[PDB]
Symmetry: C2
Subunit: 234 residues, 2 copies
């Protein structure tokens, strides 16, 4: 029970198959294609987790055979946005798979996110955001790390994906191998568009220092730090 959905309209259906792998029947996407899922707790263990973004039955890598997700009503998500709405931080200790149609993935948790041996399957882009999504008039407008000093931590067992990776947080502390098609890390207290264009920045009350130990196995790495003064240590 690492993943606990919110009790309201944006809480997805969450269950487990034998062996403990979590299966999330994501909520119906809006007209922009965004499935906005809210959680009281979001954690993934070694058994992993599967997001059902399928319009037809078939074979998932981590959870066996699954039906189509009835919640989709015939249109798959373009973006699976997972938002933790409580004060609980997230720990990602295994693989997350999008079953069915490949999608963009976001986990937002302003309380902190820790990856250690996590990874992403069948995602075009995966973004970890220690911050909150911003909505206006029911549409996703972007994200915010303003007034937040919490950490995106990546542990010794690293993070792997064949897709694009975004790491968005007030500060990042990475100690393992990050493997991705491209890595984009954006640190500081910022607001962002839906596509992680930086729209504004503010100077933190005290330093927000980020640390990258370990390695990065990617053909394209970008690190953008807006906290004037604060550093990027390697």
């Amino acid at each position: 029970n690492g993943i606990v959905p919110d009790a309201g309209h944006q809480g997805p259906d969450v269950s487990a198959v034998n062996g403990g792998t979590q299966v999330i029947n994501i909520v119906t996407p809006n007209n922009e294609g965004i499935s906005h899922n809210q959680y009281q707790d979001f954690n993934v263990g070694k058994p992993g987790a599967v997001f059902n973004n399928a319009l037809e039955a078939g074979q998932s890598q981590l959870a066996g055979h699954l039906n189509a997700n009835s919640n989709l009503n015939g249109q798959a998500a373009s973006l699976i946005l997972n938002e933790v709405v409580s004060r609980n931080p997230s720990f990602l200790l295994g693989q997350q798979e999008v079953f069915g149609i490949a999608a963009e993935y976001v986990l937002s948790n302003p309380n902190g996110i820790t990856c250690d041996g996590c990874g992403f399957i069948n995602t075009s882009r995966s973004s970890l955001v220690v911050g909150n999504p911003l909505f206006e008039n029911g549409q996703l407008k972007g994200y915010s790390t303003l007034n937040n000093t919490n950490l995106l931590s990546l542990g010794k067992n690293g993070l792997n994906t064949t897709g694009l990776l975004d790491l968005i947080a007030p500060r990042i502390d990475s100690r393992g191998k990050i493997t991705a098609a491209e890595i984009s890390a954006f640190t500081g207290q910022n607001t962002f568009s839906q596509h992680f264009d930086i729209l504004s920045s503010q100077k933190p009350v005290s330093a927000l220092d980020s640390y990258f130990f370990g390695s990065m196995q990617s053909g394209r790495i970008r690190i953008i730090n807006t906290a004037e003064g604060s550093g990027v240590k390697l």
Copy 2:
């Protein structure tokens, strides 16, 4: 005598002022604005070096009062390209200043470049290239690190500039603080345009691994590695 010009038409006039600071009266720019300077040896010590890109007399930061560079014939360089044509590697242990009109700066040395406490004054962009410039029909076409396995080393005393910085080499080993408006590092065996667009890449015969210790004090960092397999260690 850290800097020794080539004896031919692209060798600039090199001298020293009291205290040992080197002064380079760069060669006449071509119609594109490129002053292409060739050297048998190019090294900078603690006293530093000043490139005279001035159309009028005035005060340099490192070498006192200087006349205009008569070699310019009334048009300053847009790019000061310094090319080592021998087998000697380069050591940069102090500041390099463009006196007069701010310009882009390039040092190319396919034998290796080591920075340790080096820096750049009055440059819009400074690029260190462990590789060769490419010319066709007398015009600069870009740069090459093909078939080269040599190192761009940055030592414990680091590198500072208020301008843009490019680090171009088969491999980079950095152990100090790099301070720049933006840092772009491109590793592997590549060809480049004049503006460091990657045009081609080849897989090295054996691994070309790069290492970034220390820190990077810059709002925008990009690291592009084309050596398929080889890593970026932090």
